[PDB]
Amino acid sequence: LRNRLTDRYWRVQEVLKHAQHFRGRKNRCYRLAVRAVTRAF
Amino acid sequence: SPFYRYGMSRPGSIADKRKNPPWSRRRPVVVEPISDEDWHLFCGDMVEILEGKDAGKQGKVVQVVRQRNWVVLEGLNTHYRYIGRTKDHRGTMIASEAPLLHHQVKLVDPVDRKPTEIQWRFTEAGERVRVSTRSGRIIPKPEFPRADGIVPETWTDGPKDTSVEDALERTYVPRLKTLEEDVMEAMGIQETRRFKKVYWY
Amino acid sequence: GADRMSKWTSKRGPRTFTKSRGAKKTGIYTSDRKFVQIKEMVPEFVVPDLTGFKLKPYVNYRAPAGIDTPLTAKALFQETVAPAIEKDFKEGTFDANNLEKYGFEPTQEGKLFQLYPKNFPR
Amino acid sequence: GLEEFFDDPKNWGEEKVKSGASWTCQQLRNKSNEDLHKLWYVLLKERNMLLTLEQEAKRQRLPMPSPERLEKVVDSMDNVDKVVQEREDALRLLQTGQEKPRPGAWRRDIFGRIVWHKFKQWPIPWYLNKRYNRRRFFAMPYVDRFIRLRIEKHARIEARKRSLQKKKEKILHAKF
Amino acid sequence: AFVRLTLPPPKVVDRWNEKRALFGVYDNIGILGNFEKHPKELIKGPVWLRGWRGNELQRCVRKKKFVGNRMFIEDLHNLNKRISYLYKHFNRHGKYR
Amino acid sequence: LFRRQYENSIFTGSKTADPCCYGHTQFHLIPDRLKRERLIRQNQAEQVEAVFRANAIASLFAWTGAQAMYQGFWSEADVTRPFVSQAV
Amino acid sequence: ARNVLYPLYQLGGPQLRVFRTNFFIQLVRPGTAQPEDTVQFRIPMEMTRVDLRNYLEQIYNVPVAAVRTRVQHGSNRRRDHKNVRIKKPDYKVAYVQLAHGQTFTFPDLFPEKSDLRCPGIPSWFGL
Amino acid sequence: LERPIHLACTAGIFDPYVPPEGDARMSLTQRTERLRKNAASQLAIRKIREFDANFKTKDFPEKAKDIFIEAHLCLNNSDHDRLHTLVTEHCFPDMVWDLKYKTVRWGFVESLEPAQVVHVRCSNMYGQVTVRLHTRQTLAIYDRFGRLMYGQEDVPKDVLEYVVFERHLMNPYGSWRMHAKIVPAWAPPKQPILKTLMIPGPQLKPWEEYE
RNA sequence: AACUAAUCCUAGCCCUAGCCCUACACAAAUAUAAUUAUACUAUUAUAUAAAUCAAAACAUUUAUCCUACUAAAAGUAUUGGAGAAAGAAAUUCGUACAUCUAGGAGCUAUAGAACUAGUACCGCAAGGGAAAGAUGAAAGACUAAUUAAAAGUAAGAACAAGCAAAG
RNA sequence: GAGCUACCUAAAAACAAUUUUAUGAAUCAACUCGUCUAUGUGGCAAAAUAGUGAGAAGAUUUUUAGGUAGAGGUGAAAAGCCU
RNA sequence: UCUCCAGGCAUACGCGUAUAACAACUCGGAUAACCAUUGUUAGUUAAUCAGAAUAGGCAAUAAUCACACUAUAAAUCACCUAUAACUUCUCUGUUAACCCAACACCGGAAUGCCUAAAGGAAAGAUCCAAAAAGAUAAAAGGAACUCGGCAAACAAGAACC
Ligand SMILES: [Mg+2]
Ligand SMILES: [Mg+2]
Ligand SMILES: [Mg+2]
Ligand SMILES: [Mg+2]
Ligand SMILES: [Mg+2]
Ligand SMILES: [Mg+2]
Ligand SMILES: [Mg+2]
Ligand SMILES: [Mg+2]
Ligand SMILES: [Mg+2]
Ligand SMILES: [Mg+2]
Ligand SMILES: [Mg+2]
Ligand SMILES: [Mg+2]
Ligand SMILES: [Mg+2]
Ligand SMILES: [Mg+2]
Ligand SMILES: [Mg+2]
Ligand SMILES: [Mg+2]
Ligand SMILES: [Mg+2]
Ligand SMILES: [Mg+2]
Ligand SMILES: [Mg+2]
Ligand SMILES: [Mg+2]
Ligand SMILES: [Mg+2]
Ligand SMILES: [Mg+2]
Ligand SMILES: [Mg+2]
Ligand SMILES: [Mg+2]
Ligand SMILES: [Mg+2]
Ligand SMILES: [Mg+2]
Ligand SMILES: [Mg+2]
Ligand SMILES: [Mg+2]
Ligand SMILES: [Mg+2]
Ligand SMILES: [Mg+2]
């Protein structure tokens, strides 16, 4: 694994920060959160 | 075993078995290699602590763990602990020594109490002796009590222990005869039969 | 479903399967299904008389151990054979043919105890 | 008698028993063959008593008193065995010139390896023994490919070991 | 994702060690030395790629050509299989015909 | 002494139908394995007499007990007549 | 003697003499109840019952009347941290019946022979 | 143990000096008593002089008093590192063991009467000096939660205690450290804990009956 | 005001360079149902690699596989259902770092060897084949800490109406 | 790879009672098989259970060891069986 | 002690300490108790039970209670002549609730003796629902059921393509 992405933490927080006021797993599960955030925008 | 770590507790003791189980895989300790010739610190040597909590304090070596390049001084570099603790009682507070690496101490010149660096050199008889780098002098090997607790001078033998004279008596007479032949002649056994031919292969 | 790693011993297998546990044979099974023990094949323990013997299991801690010098063929030869040959050479009564006089053994055959091939146990 | 399988009755129940040093090889070398023969049995009786005592402690779930005595006795018996072995080995060399008491040979097994073969005693010569002849001391041509594979397998192991030493030296010098 | 909870040890680099300080010296051995030696002769590496470059199929064939007769059985079998795979890839597969 | 499970038998030397249902004398030959000279070498000198006694007690109890059971006497119906036999 | 070659015997051969003995035995307390004459021994797997008779009579000067032996299988069930079976060694048990009416009983080794009204405050304080 | 365990202090007092009933008064006499027991104690002083050569009973009370004040003041800060130097390993657990998770405010008010050496002893070799101290002190201990459980925030109470100091004469780095306190039987009882206690009675199983 | 967890750095590995090797490292046991101290009963590789696959099928044919110095001559001469493809030599050049055991714009526990191990386990057998570890100078200082931090829960069930949000 | 299964070779074993023209006969156990139904359907079971049924001195059943191997073997042919 | 159930004990093959005691109460038993689990210590004892010299010559006549008989498928070293040897007990198996089925599997598993003298327990506690499964009983009727008397029956008989 010569080159592994090291910043994925902040890429994930980009989406989840917009989803924290949703209800359900939409607000914390990235695969679901990303779809919800795109509809909100 | 490669993953064994040498500690203050003697190898093979109950304490060591608890510390070094077969499944332990702790990170190796890195020790600067020192040849048997290179090492110059021995139990009973007075040494001075160059640095640390007790920097500048002279002490006497009492244990040497060569696998960690450790020298332990009695009553120095000492922290505090409770010995003999049980559920009912706290135990007794004691001061416990910690190991000091070789480079953190220096040997002490006997006549003048100072941390003199030493060099290994032979003598007239040929015996290897430590000599001080400055103020060239013979620092004799100190005498330390035997680890097992046996003092040879005070030792008085009981039954089943050979006396000195008996052990050192010479009875061997060199001859071209095996122990088997010697015993038969001594014990008077007579055997005139001989083994038949056997083929080795 | 069999165990491949455990040792094959006589406890395992059918009754027909039998094998020894390493004991030396002491006799012969003749015809008619008869065991005949041989007295010579049975080891005999040569035990000395220990009366008056001064050596005991342990030694004084004050007894000095000596410098280790394992015995060599040369060391044995000098102690035993050299003085005789040296004395005979000065007297001149020495010849190659009579090395047996000083203790040489031309062959091991006919000896009860043969050094090679060894024919006695420890 | 059977009393010799146990310690002195006074010593029974004592937490420790005082014992001297074990026999060293050089001290034994001074002794004669006859004396070593007697000394062997003296140690043997002591060894049996300690082995007897060791087992009884396990049954009673107690510590064995002065367990170092057992190691000392075993060390003494090895030295007696060594000294007797040395004397026999020297005498064999002088009279026969052979370095081993047992005949043997260097042979190639069916797997393509070189192994020292220890000879056995038989009552008949080798060419008349049908069990012996069934044993094969040669390898057929299908083994050469395996012979090379072992050499290459071994060469990889040696290469890794040498590399790892060089890596470990880097850590030492970097650390110191 | 999970992240380190501590800073790793700082990296210490000596920029003036002998290897870094003298890097490049004698790269003009030819033009400044009357062309007795070509600079490629200063390259240290595998025997089959000193002063040479090529694609992976070329490198595999070149290694076999140079040291194929001194290779271990496992290695040579793997190298030969790699050649046949690369041969089929470069000569039959791809977007551009 | 070792155990096995097989047919239980009570036999006097002949079946119950035989008129001669009582015993007079038994003759036993000690096996060579148990003879005097071997026993002395094995160091069990005191067993020379013991070998004879064990053979008598076992053999004669078996015979007389089998005779008694031929007459209908068993553990719960003990013998009314003493049953006698002798052996050399 | 164990771990050694014995000279092969053929008709007319000498007697086999072992001058130094390699067999080591230990007297063990019977697990079960045994007759007074019987004594238990744990012996090397290569020792025969004939060997034990000569061993005891000659080395220890004890008269023996009969010897029986059995080979006890050692457990192979326990496993180590790597799940590798641990083998307990197989051994041989010998039962020796003493002679001359002598009796033996295994000897008894190892014979033997703050204040509740101010709690939580150190008493050291004298105030 | 391959290495002998090292002890720089010995638990207990070699000879427990018995204070004289009524000694707590006039806050000579006891000065004479050490002179009177010179055979038992002056010999100990003579031995202490050999290894020390600067041991003078006249000046020890001032130094001995100084150690006592400083040692207790470590309790307020909870500077165990300092306190180890001031007190012996025997004294340390007694002072500090039950003060864990507690805060103690201790101050020393003016001493009522001059401190005096009263009894010394010697045993490789240890020398113990008993000193008599009469002083007014303040103490207040608190909970985890800051609630007061013992003592009065600030009032001075006169205390008479006998404190034993000790030194390891052989060691070059030995020093005089507070070792123990001898309590007289005639001493009045100490102040009680503020709270109230329940002392449970015997617990009985159904089989048993109360007696 | 936290559970489940998370963080870690070295065990070793990879590729080269250099270099033939000569290690073949107690006693005893083993080719008998291996590891069973002795006779019974004799002991011994293989004739050409094939196919898959490519030729958009397939049927002659299909580089490496099936090795004999680099670079050039040259993808040339030649060979080929003259299709797919295959493919020289003559002849020129080359003293290779040399010295001693070195090097890494290689991996860092799902990586790098399958490997802590050809073990555990699975298979009658040939064979297949894992997983994981982390205190400190000292444990002869009671085993270390560090982190609103994953999903999942708890602290704290819910309250007409609806892709669950947006204004 | 024939410790399952197919067939074979060698050495062995089991078959009560009741009738009979005296037997690949009859009735019916042990034993072998598996007709029909219900249950079960991640089951007790990767084919069983519970009943009901077929044969049961024979081309019977069963045990131990050996044999035949995939371009093959075996097959009272179901293209069935060969872990 | 009581109530009830009715394949048990040996050997072979296989298994390999699951045997027994103590101590533990993490893991294992699909839950407890208790241990089949963990640790330690012990164990299975044999001359009768079981396993493990050579060269020649030579044979018509089953078994079945072997007699009478009948049968057909045609069916088990010895003895003799010579030679050689001229007193021996070592070695190995022996425990168990156990083996093959991934399991403490309603399955598979050979022989001898016996059929309860041996070996065992269908219900953790409570409740008395529906549906589902199994057993018994049925007023009047008696195949009107159903593709079909499938299944069940106080029946288990007859006959034909
Ligand atoms: Mg094609
Ligand atoms: Mg097609
Ligand atoms: Mg095709
Ligand atoms: Mg073709
Ligand atoms: Mg890995
Ligand atoms: Mg892996
Ligand atoms: Mg969360
Ligand atoms: Mg709404
Ligand atoms: Mg078969
Ligand atoms: Mg019948
Ligand atoms: Mg019929
Ligand atoms: Mg029928
Ligand atoms: Mg019919
Ligand atoms: Mg058929
Ligand atoms: Mg058909
Ligand atoms: Mg068809
Ligand atoms: Mg219990
Ligand atoms: Mg459970
Ligand atoms: Mg049990
Ligand atoms: Mg258990
Ligand atoms: Mg036996
Ligand atoms: Mg049994
Ligand atoms: Mg199953
Ligand atoms: Mg019963
Ligand atoms: Mg119920
Ligand atoms: Mg009904
Ligand atoms: Mg009705
Ligand atoms: Mg109808
Ligand atoms: Mg209708
Ligand atoms: Mg019906």
Swiss-Prot record, chain C:
InterPro entries: Ribosomal_mL41. GO terms for biological process: apoptotic process; mitochondrial translation; translation. One of its GO terms (cellular component) is mitochondrion. The keyword Cell cycle applies. Keywords: Apoptosis, Cell cycle, Mitochondrion, Ribonucleoprotein, Ribosomal protein, Transit peptide. It is found in: Mitochondrion. Pfam families: MRP-L27 (PF09809). GO terms for molecular function: structural constituent of ribosome. Component of the mitochondrial ribosome large subunit. Also involved in apoptosis and cell cycle. Enhances p53/TP53 stability, thereby contributing to p53/TP53-induced apoptosis in response to growth-inhibitory condition. Enhances p53/TP53 translocation to the mitochondria. Has the ability to arrest the cell cycle at the G1 phase, possibly by stabilizing the CDKN1A and CDKN1B (p27Kip1) proteins. Belongs to the mitochondrion-specific ribosomal protein mL41 family. Component of the mitochondrial ribosome large subunit (39S) which comprises a 16S rRNA and about 50 distinct proteins. Interacts with BCL2. This is Large ribosomal subunit protein mL41. It comes from Mus musculus.
Curated annotation (Swiss-Prot), chain E:
GO terms for molecular function: structural constituent of ribosome. One of its GO terms (biological process) is mitochondrial translation. Keywords: Mitochondrion, Ribonucleoprotein, Ribosomal protein, Transit peptide. Belongs to the mitochondrion-specific ribosomal protein mL51 family. Its main location: mitochondrion. It is found in: Mitochondrion. Component of the mitochondrial ribosome large subunit (39S) which comprises a 16S rRNA and about 50 distinct proteins. Interacts with OXA1L. It comes from the Eukaryota. One of its GO terms (cellular component) is mitochondrial large ribosomal subunit. It comes from Mus musculus. Transmembrane segments: none annotated. This is Large ribosomal subunit protein mL51.
From Swiss-Prot, chain G:
GO terms for molecular function: structural constituent of ribosome. SUPFAM superfamilies: Ribosomal proteins S24e, L23 and L15e (SSF54189). Gene3D superfamilies: 3.30.70.330. Component of the mitochondrial ribosome large subunit (39S) which comprises a 16S rRNA and about 50 distinct proteins. The keyword Ribonucleoprotein applies. It comes from Mus musculus. GO terms for biological process: mitochondrial translation; translation. It comes from the Eukaryota. The gene is Mrpl23. Transmembrane segments: none annotated. It is found in: Mitochondrion. This is Large ribosomal subunit protein uL23m. GO terms for cellular component: cytosolic ribosome; mitochondrial inner membrane; mitochondrial large ribosomal subunit; mitochondrion. The keyword Hydrolase does not apply. Keywords: Mitochondrion, Ribonucleoprotein, Ribosomal protein. Belongs to the universal ribosomal protein uL23 family. Its main location: mitochondrion.
UniProtKB/Swiss-Prot annotation, chain H:
It is found in: Mitochondrion. Its main location: mitochondrion. GO terms for molecular function: structural constituent of ribosome. The keyword Mitochondrion applies. GO terms for cellular component: mitochondrial inner membrane; mitochondrial large ribosomal subunit; mitochondrion. Keywords: Mitochondrion, Ribonucleoprotein, Ribosomal protein, Transit peptide. GO terms for biological process: mitochondrial translation. Belongs to the mitochondrion-specific ribosomal protein mL45 family. Component of the mitochondrial ribosome large subunit (39S) which comprises a 16S rRNA and about 50 distinct proteins. Component of the mitochondrial large ribosomal subunit (mt-LSU). Within the mitochondrial ribosomes, required to direct the nascent polypeptide toward the tunnel exit and position the exit at a distance from the membrane surface. This is Large ribosomal subunit protein mL45. It comes from Mus musculus. The chain holds residues 72 to 294 of 306 of the full protein.
